[PDB]
Amino acid sequence: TPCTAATAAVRAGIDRDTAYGAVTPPIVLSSNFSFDGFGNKRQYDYTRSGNPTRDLLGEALAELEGGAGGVITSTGMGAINLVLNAVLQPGDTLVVPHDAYGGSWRLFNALAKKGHFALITADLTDPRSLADALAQSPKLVLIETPSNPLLRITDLRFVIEAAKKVGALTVVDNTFLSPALQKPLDFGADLVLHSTTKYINGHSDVVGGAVVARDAELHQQLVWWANALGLTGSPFDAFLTLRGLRTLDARLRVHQENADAIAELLDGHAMVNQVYFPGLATHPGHALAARQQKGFGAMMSFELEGGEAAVRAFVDGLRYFTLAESLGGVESLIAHPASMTHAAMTAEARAAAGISDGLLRLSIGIESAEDLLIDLRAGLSRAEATL
Amino acid sequence: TPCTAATAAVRAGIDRDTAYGAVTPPIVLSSNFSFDGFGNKRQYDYTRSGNPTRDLLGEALAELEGGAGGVITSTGMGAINLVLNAVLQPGDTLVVPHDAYGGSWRLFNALAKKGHFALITADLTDPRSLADALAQSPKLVLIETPSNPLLRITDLRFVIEAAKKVGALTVVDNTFLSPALQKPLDFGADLVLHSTTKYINGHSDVVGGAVVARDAELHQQLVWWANALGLTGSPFDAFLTLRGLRTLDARLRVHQENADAIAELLDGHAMVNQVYFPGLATHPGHALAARQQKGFGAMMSFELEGGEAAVRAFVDGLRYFTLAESLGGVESLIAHPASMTHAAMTAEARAAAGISDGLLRLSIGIESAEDLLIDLRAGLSRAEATL
Amino acid sequence: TPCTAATAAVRAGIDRDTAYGAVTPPIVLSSNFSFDGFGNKRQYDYTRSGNPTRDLLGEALAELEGGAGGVITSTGMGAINLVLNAVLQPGDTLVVPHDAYGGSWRLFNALAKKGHFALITADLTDPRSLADALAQSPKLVLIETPSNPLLRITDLRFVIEAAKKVGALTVVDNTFLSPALQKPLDFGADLVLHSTTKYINGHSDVVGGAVVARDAELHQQLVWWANALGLTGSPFDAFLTLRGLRTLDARLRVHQENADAIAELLDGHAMVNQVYFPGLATHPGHALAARQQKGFGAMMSFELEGGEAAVRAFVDGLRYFTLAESLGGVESLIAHPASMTHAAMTAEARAAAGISDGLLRLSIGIESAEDLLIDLRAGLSRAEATL
Amino acid sequence: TPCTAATAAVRAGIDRDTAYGAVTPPIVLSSNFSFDGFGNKRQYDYTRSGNPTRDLLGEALAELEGGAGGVITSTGMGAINLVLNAVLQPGDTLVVPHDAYGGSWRLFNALAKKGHFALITADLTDPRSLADALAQSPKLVLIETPSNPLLRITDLRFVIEAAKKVGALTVVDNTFLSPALQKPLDFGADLVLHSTTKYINGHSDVVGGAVVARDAELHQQLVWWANALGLTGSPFDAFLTLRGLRTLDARLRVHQENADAIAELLDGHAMVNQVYFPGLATHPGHALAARQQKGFGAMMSFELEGGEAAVRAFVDGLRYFTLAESLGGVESLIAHPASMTHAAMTAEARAAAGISDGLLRLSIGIESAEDLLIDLRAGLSRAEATLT
């Protein structure tokens, strides 16, 4: 037996201190490391390049994703930035999803306008749209599945093998499910990346990113570029993230129980026009999600009856969903993407993503199921009183 | 509606930052707080007396335990110390259990030798022993249930009512189960205390204590003595401890799933002489534990067949159980009470308690059941190979 | 040759990490440490008993003070508390100074009322008072020099030799000057203790304490009691405190430059009635301070002309002196001891000490002399404009 | 009056907590902040974009440098990365110094090979080399003065006014002196940047960067680009960095006293061929440094008599100088740039910078001067023993 995912996350850095046998791993804040006398670099020399505390988190995310190594960055956007710098140069074309996170769109459109690469935004749920993009010989394809905030599911085996036939690398943003629930590298992706800010840290008190490469040579290109660009993260942040990771399995058990229950409430409720949640049998992509994921996760969005006034009445009064950005915390959250998470997009790119001005997104926490439903039901009455 | 205990713990100090609306509470390390002009103390003035980060943890443990307030100490022994100093003076008698934590035994016995109080050490699970202790008019009775490390169960309602009949205060050490699995104040106790070092924190990276009093007058007295003796904990530690608390309900589900599966493997295994786990119907205290606890927890101890050779072969080779003191963490631990946790006791006090030299204690973490069971089976073999 | 005090403090735990050669020492938060197989304790086992980050700070304060070792407590009051429990039992007598810190007065008086020891409160600067206290065969004499807040100076060599003649142990509270400015163990004292909250830390972001013993056997006793009472500090706090120590010598140069410039402005200013600063030749204790101290420090207090209205006009408007408790930070502070630092005292104990109701105490930080002097001059006019 | 530099750094974030009046500022680790009800962003929304604890450090460095605002990044190299991204695009030319930090060189050469900008590497101490480079109409000139590790001084008024005449922006890497000792924005620079890893933090336990812009609009472009690229720093690092900043003045007083003493020992010692230290009267740029800086700093390098054997003997046995990378700490350090800090450069870029294979670089700490000199003298004995 190698261990399971859960054991590996729990034991990450446990009993791995050669100095004192501390059970919990020491925080190495040091910027620098001594040489072992003249000409003799130790394993570490300088934290920007390499840090033992940061590398425990890289090693654990690599073990969980099945890759050769991991690079930990100061932010999620910083992981995406790392991949774009290590892989693309001018004259290269990048294919991105139409409904990627608004911050990814912002970065892709900014760097493309400078000429750092050419940009094709496509619908990867959609074989025609994918084949028109792959006919242009892209260096790189990015997949974000399930997608933020409409939970569109893209067929990892389909898109990754279509892109291999034309010689493109693949990178998957696996933020929304974590490595506990989806392993894109199992499907042949070259790279998997995360905002550790979300479920991997789980406590809404670190911003971070990670990139795991399947192949040892691409891992070393990422290490080199991270060091050179100074995109690497703080050892203290890596300490809190590794601490968070140890409860990832236990947290997701509750996130998913709570989300199955809230999906049941919102599906078919009189005051709800549409629910987007991969666990619903009627959601386009349900069968795909069931085969490529080990769970349906705990992100969902939904559209209320009754326009702006219903949205305002629903949101103002929530006791247990904080109105705020981010997701993946132990604490439940709610967001209005048009005006918050996806406000960096133009009204046109939103229209093309199918993100309406009335869409609410839930990040379902690990509070008691009974309390989240009392809160959501009172919300739905407040919105009904509006008609 | 009030929220459940689990909701309260997940959301303690969420969106309670008047400065910026931070979702996660800011860490207030400051030793000191400005006055609001001459004569105008704010809410806080000095961190030894009171600090807001520490008070979030205080207010959270008091909500969970049903008390008027909570005091956070540098350590668990510190929380016991605070209670002895606030409640007892020379000529007062204290009744303690015979099978309490060895460190509790060391402190009671050192402060009794100096004459801070008179000490009676009784078996609180046996009525004759209890009645003889209560007939000597004690100021304070301490209960520790379940007991470390034999998991003896003492009848909270019985002992507390019996102690009120003679004017004694009662304090319960509730470390082994946390507030999520046992609420002694519900049964009339005046004081409950914890080593927060264990389940409450959950990440083996903070030593700390807490005392919660039912009554506001007794809470104001503990606040005064904690400030005067200098027993209060660090704000950074409260911060990590509070972060720990948010996953307590989530952690204990997996803890209890794993402990049930491990009790079943150990009980009537040929190499296992006795299992002490209150979840087994054959354990003296099982039905009392099913009544006064929400669950049977994840601490257990066992005797192997085959003397000291068998213990050694069992322990050397464990991959997933670290040989170490402490308990209540996400990572699985094993200890040998006689030489480790209860080394502070004399050989006669261990014999009176029923702690043999062949006893092993397990703290069962939240790794996969299957990896822990493979690890224990390999150990039982190595013990068998010794005969 | 050995290095100086300053070199030792700057380099405490620099290049002393066997794991990675980290230049700065790693933070060991871990509550627990693995055994090296069955029966083999490593150097550390449990953080309440010993922790390597806390021991760098202990070992550093013991080098600076000339001691056999040091113990780091959660607070300064906790270090006094540790010494009272390690050294005293009922029937023993303790001699304390009349103008000790009000928090010391609160603890001595509360533990004396319970009868943990008998208390003699003497004026240690006056030989009759000292002789009458030493004629009563005390187990322990506590000296606080200079005294908070009137900067009375007690003759370390005289009092210590007098206490040895009658078999008493001596403990000195060396908080106001730190080890960089006064070394009581050089004059034969048994114990020196500190509030690390002040100059040692220097950044007003840690409450902590330290006790250093001259003799190895008394150090082993303080280690034992600190573990058994649970009085030990947080490793995170020891890390910030060690980081503070590194600039102690550099900080005190500027503190003393600023204090000299400010004592000169206040002494025979028309609005100032008395200055208490041991650096002035007119201060009872100046020549003793010049002999037993490397410098006059940066604490001072003063009485304004014009009663309560003048104090209020002086305090309300200060830009660079914050109205707060504590002292010894980089930032300048002002306090009113009667209502703030020494409110724990009765009005009668304050009168016996010579703490009037019109007294102000300054902690002078490391801001520019010119910005502090402009700030004080403006206060002196506001106080003038009151008459 | 407004306050001095020392007062500003000491009082940064002091008594600035509206929640409890904490004297020392709270650490806001929170990734997110609540909205004030539907449609109502508060001052902060998301730490990657902006965080109050990080903003105290940005504000304080902006006050110290005289600029409109500051952006704090996860590293020093990340600050340089932020500037190249916010200011340059393909077809733009960037002028850099020949003797810049080998990490800067690595990044300039890597991004120039991809085509992100055209690169001109010039000697900015040398007026013909500067004027050949400004004839090429560059978007941006970077100055690193004093330079790492030969302490070459570049004339801020000269180079910045030459670059304004041809329409180029100026950015100055001011790591080596800190804002306490050189204010490039006083000389007209558009941008100053720092590795806060060095003197600003001072305690070797944070990697960090900062960029301060003179102009509000360029600060707003930096905030935007830092958010979009995800270059922003951790709030906990910004907390430790602000804590170190509070002792910057007091640390530099001892750094400079110790460096004057060590310069005096090495200058004209029989075992020392060359010392590079701006505070020596015989160092090229001494009068320029005396004028454009408020002190000569505590960085120096030097070349020993006696080849590789002398270097190996000097270094092995130092009790108080740790052999390691970085600088600006309270703890004294020694580095061999060819094989450590400048190993990222090619042997030709080093030869062009004048960084020989025998150069040792001292970062002088705040230990007792008497101890640092006992250590250096024993080292010079050890290298002497190597001839005979």
Ligand SMILES: Cc1ncc(COP(=O)(O)O)c(/C=N/[C@@H](CCSC[C@H](N)C(=O)O)C(=O)O)c1O
């Ligand atoms: C699939 C995916 N990949 C990557 C990322 C980036 O990870 P980070 O860098 O944040 O750690 C995210 C983040 N998502 C957050 C972002 C909040 S909006 C940002 C802010 N106002 C801004 O203007 O930017 C969310 O949707 O709630 C992400 O959902």
Ligand SMILES: Cc1ncc(COP(=O)(O)O)c(/C=N/[C@@H](CCSC[C@H](N)C(=O)O)C(=O)O)c1O
């Ligand atoms: C029921 C109870 N109440 C209180 C406490 C005290 O709480 P803390 O102070 O540790 O946070 C504990 C601790 N128990 C731990 C620690 C053993 S450490 C031995 C050490 N070498 C020493 O000499 O002490 C255990 O059995 O593993 C406790 O089980």
Ligand SMILES: Cc1ncc(COP(=O)(O)O)c(/C=N/[C@@H](CCSC[C@H](N)C(=O)O)C(=O)O)c1O
């Ligand atoms: C010479 C000495 N020894 C010991 C100590 C104790 O050290 P700490 O425990 O604080 O670290 C001090 C502290 N002195 C501070 C604290 C005043 S706090 C009043 C507070 N509300 C309370 O009720 O206490 C001062 O005068 O400013 C001390 O001057």
Ligand SMILES: Cc1ncc(COP(=O)(O)O)c(/C=N/[C@@H](CCSC[C@H](N)C(=O)O)C(=O)O)c1O
């Ligand atoms: C003037 C200047 N600007 C910027 C920076 C960059 O700042 P940081 O990102 O490190 O904070 C520096 C750094 N200087 C360090 C770097 C050590 S080498 C690093 C490593 N092995 C690698 O391969 O990179 C030094 O010379 O000792 C710098 O001197």
